Design a protein around this ligand. Sequence first.
Ligand SMILES: CO[C@@H]1C[C@@H](C[C@@H]2O[C@@H](C)[C@@H](O)[C@@H](O)[C@@H]2O)[C@H](O)[C@@H](CO)O1
Ligand SMILES: CO[C@@H]1C[C@@H](C[C@@H]2O[C@@H](C)[C@@H](O)[C@@H](O)[C@@H]2O)[C@H](O)[C@@H](CO)O1
Ligand SMILES: CO[C@@H]1C[C@@H](C[C@@H]2O[C@@H](C)[C@@H](O)[C@@H](O)[C@@H]2O)[C@H](O)[C@@H](CO)O1
Ligand SMILES: CO[C@@H]1C[C@@H](C[C@@H]2O[C@@H](C)[C@@H](O)[C@@H](O)[C@@H]2O)[C@H](O)[C@@H](CO)O1
Ligand SMILES: CO[C@@H]1C[C@@H](C[C@@H]2O[C@@H](C)[C@@H](O)[C@@H](O)[C@@H]2O)[C@H](O)[C@@H](CO)O1
Ligand SMILES: CO[C@@H]1C[C@@H](C[C@@H]2O[C@@H](C)[C@@H](O)[C@@H](O)[C@@H]2O)[C@H](O)[C@@H](CO)O1
Ligand SMILES: CO[C@@H]1C[C@@H](C[C@@H]2O[C@@H](C)[C@@H](O)[C@@H](O)[C@@H]2O)[C@H](O)[C@@H](CO)O1
Ligand SMILES: CO[C@@H]1C[C@@H](C[C@@H]2O[C@@H](C)[C@@H](O)[C@@H](O)[C@@H]2O)[C@H](O)[C@@H](CO)O1
Ligand SMILES: [Cl-]
Ligand SMILES: [Cl-]
Ligand SMILES: [Cl-]
Ligand SMILES: [Cl-]
Ligand SMILES: [Cl-]
Ligand SMILES: [Cl-]
Ligand code: NA
Ligand code: NA
Ligand code: NA
Lengths: 344, 347
Amino acid sequence: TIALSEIVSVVNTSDGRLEVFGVGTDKAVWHNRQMAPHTGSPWSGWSSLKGQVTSKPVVYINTDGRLEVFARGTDNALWHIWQTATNAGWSNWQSLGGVITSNPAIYANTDGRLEVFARGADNALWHISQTTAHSGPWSSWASLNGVITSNPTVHINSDGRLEVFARGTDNALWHIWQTAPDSNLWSSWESLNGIITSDPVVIDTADGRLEVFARGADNALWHIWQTISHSGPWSGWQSLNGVITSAPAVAKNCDNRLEAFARGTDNALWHTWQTVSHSGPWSSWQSLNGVITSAPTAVRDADGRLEVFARGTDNALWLTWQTASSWSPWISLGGVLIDASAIK
Amino acid sequence: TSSTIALSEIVSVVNTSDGRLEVFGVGTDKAVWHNRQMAPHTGSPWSGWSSLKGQVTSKPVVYINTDGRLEVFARGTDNALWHIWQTATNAGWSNWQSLGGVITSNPAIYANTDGRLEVFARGADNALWHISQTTAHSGPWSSWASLNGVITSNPTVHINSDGRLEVFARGTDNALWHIWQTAPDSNLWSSWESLNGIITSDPVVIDTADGRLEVFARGADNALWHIWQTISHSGPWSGWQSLNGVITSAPAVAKNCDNRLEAFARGTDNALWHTWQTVSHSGPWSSWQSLNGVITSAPTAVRDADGRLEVFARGTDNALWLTWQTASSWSPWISLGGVLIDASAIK
Ligand SMILES: CO[C@@H]1C[C@@H](C[C@@H]2O[C@@H](C)[C@@H](O)[C@@H](O)[C@@H]2O)[C@H](O)[C@@H](CO)O1
Ligand SMILES: CO[C@@H]1C[C@@H](C[C@@H]2O[C@@H](C)[C@@H](O)[C@@H](O)[C@@H]2O)[C@H](O)[C@@H](CO)O1
Ligand SMILES: CO[C@@H]1C[C@@H](C[C@@H]2O[C@@H](C)[C@@H](O)[C@@H](O)[C@@H]2O)[C@H](O)[C@@H](CO)O1
Ligand SMILES: CO[C@@H]1C[C@@H](C[C@@H]2O[C@@H](C)[C@@H](O)[C@@H](O)[C@@H]2O)[C@H](O)[C@@H](CO)O1
Ligand SMILES: CO[C@@H]1C[C@@H](C[C@@H]2O[C@@H](C)[C@@H](O)[C@@H](O)[C@@H]2O)[C@H](O)[C@@H](CO)O1
Ligand SMILES: CO[C@@H]1C[C@@H](C[C@@H]2O[C@@H](C)[C@@H](O)[C@@H](O)[C@@H]2O)[C@H](O)[C@@H](CO)O1
Ligand SMILES: CO[C@@H]1C[C@@H](C[C@@H]2O[C@@H](C)[C@@H](O)[C@@H](O)[C@@H]2O)[C@H](O)[C@@H](CO)O1
Ligand SMILES: CO[C@@H]1C[C@@H](C[C@@H]2O[C@@H](C)[C@@H](O)[C@@H](O)[C@@H]2O)[C@H](O)[C@@H](CO)O1
Ligand SMILES: [Cl-]
Ligand SMILES: [Cl-]
Ligand SMILES: [Cl-]
Ligand SMILES: [Cl-]
Ligand SMILES: [Cl-]
Ligand SMILES: [Cl-]
Ligand code: NA
Ligand code: NA
Ligand code: NA
């Protein structure tokens, strides 16, 4: 098991509008986007990209601006659908084959080739890549071994080497990395210890260090990081306190202060944030109210403000964002969303 | 046909792989020197100046590879394009090496969507020539090739929100001209096209929060002018609009935390002045305001790791001086020392 998942995948697109992808009651992928590149913009409303999915769908932006959505299909293969251009429509759904048993995790190599990581039926971490920048065709599937028990998450280091994180069979946080950018050469699997009870969430700090967040065995939010830009040694685990009842979501304010969000024991949204600067101490947890039924999903918009999405008690997606003085009242974006996470 | 441009910037600035500001300029010895923040925060102490040696006959221009490695390009004493690079991300530097060619402008650099750096410069024949890395963030480099044209300023390159590189330069009729890749990563380019106007500076290009290119340049009336792609990207640009002012240097433009553009230029009194969008990145421009100082170059503007604009400019003592945004105002001008010269291949 893992902490309740994020229900949507969201990005700030090439034209500065937020765009969210979720799964409907019909198992199709639906999406919704801002009309305008600003906090409080009207929304398109929900429209279906069709498909039938059996994981969380995850959107990623190609290095040419085009959105591409990845999800497991009803045959357990990895499937995908992409924009034909940044302000045009979408391709047909296409299979990338394989048999997978987690949500896909996606990142762009420094050379522009997307690389997708997913758990296999043998519980090892598998991967596949675009053979040339922001384009098909793709490589064949290969394994990076291990035995993982959570959805994997990938990020890139400040020197260009991808690094993948996942919970191990001992419930510790484990990781593996490219030994050079764009490479098929990887390190050994190594343990960062800890006991984690959510999927990991990985971010890069302003000063070039990977930092991972997860719920711990005590249901507090815990975090651990590289002590040097793109290098070990790692810190020990440190608690950010709280008692959280979902996965956390983390995003950067426009000044690079990190801010974490999670559902609390009263089912409200709560958050804690760095104060003063991106090197400063973390605040106490404070409530943003609401009554939520998923983990929150956080993103910085084109006005440099954080916006947070979460499924509501009616199964619609609701939204709250930063104001000068505070946060805005919760508003509904409608829809009926389900948690399709391949690992729960 | 103009053979001059507004006074240039004195340094090339970059945000490092670990979020620090690092600047590059030319010493009185004609070597490339550099200076960086100790820490990624507004008001950090600086390392002080250290030499990367070389002997340059252009402005040296830094760019950051997609693997985090800094790379500096400069015209050499033999008029070839030369470069020097970090051998590892944020660590040691290579020796200077020649990429050949015969160039007659400062170089301008961008990364393609596939991670290949591509360098543009005016040639001996006055056309725009170009050369690229053959593989992502690595040598060896391609053959030199021409994009034709006849150009009379330093070129400036930027990338479209769909990954197509686009180069801008002054033409023989003093207008702003441009040329673009027809696909990302490609050697297929459009023809040269005119955006009209009269420009009296190098063009300055940026990408807005909503994914459009916008170009700024001093006009024939010495005001700051700008022009932009439209939201439909359908061929037409906006037509030129004045931001007024009377400026005596090239402009610098950067994005604030919230993506509001902000422009900087020297005034008739040799102070730094600035004008900014208000409310949002779609908002209207303010009137000009002085940031005082007495400066002897164009300003160079950049946003730091705390989300604050920092602005550098050469001072009356030929040292590099610096002022930054505070919550309230802007900080007093402070000196980073050094003795810098303007080595621009076109002035
Ligand atoms: C007419 O069928 C094609 C393939 C469908 C893809 C569906 O969705 C995929 C993700 C997989 O789950 C497939 O098993 C599933 O059929 C897709 O939904 C449909 C409409 O866009 O086109
Ligand atoms: C002794 O074998 C080492 C470490 C293994 C890591 C495995 O996968 C990790 C992610 C954890 O679940 C571990 O508990 C588990 O043994 C790993 O699979 C193996 C081959 O790559 O080498
Ligand atoms: C006075 O009530 C409003 C709406 C509440 C929103 C709640 O939380 C939302 C996220 C949804 O789940 C709604 O169905 C749910 O009622 C919200 O918590 C409250 C906080 O001041 O104001
Ligand atoms: C008037 O109905 C439209 C389409 C609805 C789409 C809903 O939300 C989608 C995500 C799927 O779950 C659909 O099955 C579900 O009906 C959506 O709930 C509603 C919100 O105002 O607008
Ligand atoms: C002893 O010479 C080598 C290459 C030199 C590069 C110099 O600087 C380059 C940028 C070019 O202008 C060359 O023509 C010029 O020689 C460089 O300055 C020197 C470092 O001490 O080593
Ligand atoms: C026969 O001339 C056309 C347009 C030329 C563009 C040139 O280069 C431009 C940048 C401007 O300076 C123009 O005034 C100049 O003629 C261009 O060089 C030539 C070859 O492609 O075709
Ligand atoms: C198609 O462009 C022309 C020239 C423009 C003015 C010129 O171009 C501007 C950029 C400045 O340099 C001005 O001083 C100069 O007069 C002028 O703004 C415009 C009038 O509609 O038409
Ligand atoms: C009442 O005159 C002021 C100064 C003008 C700014 C001009 O442009 C600035 C950038 C500097 O060069 C100034 O010295 C120059 O006067 C400014 O544009 C004008 C707006 O009404 O008010
Ligand atoms: Cl759990
Ligand atoms: Cl992305
Ligand atoms: Cl001039
Ligand atoms: Cl305006
Ligand atoms: Cl004033
Ligand atoms: Cl000088
Ligand atoms: Na964006
Ligand atoms: Na393998
Ligand atoms: Na000249």
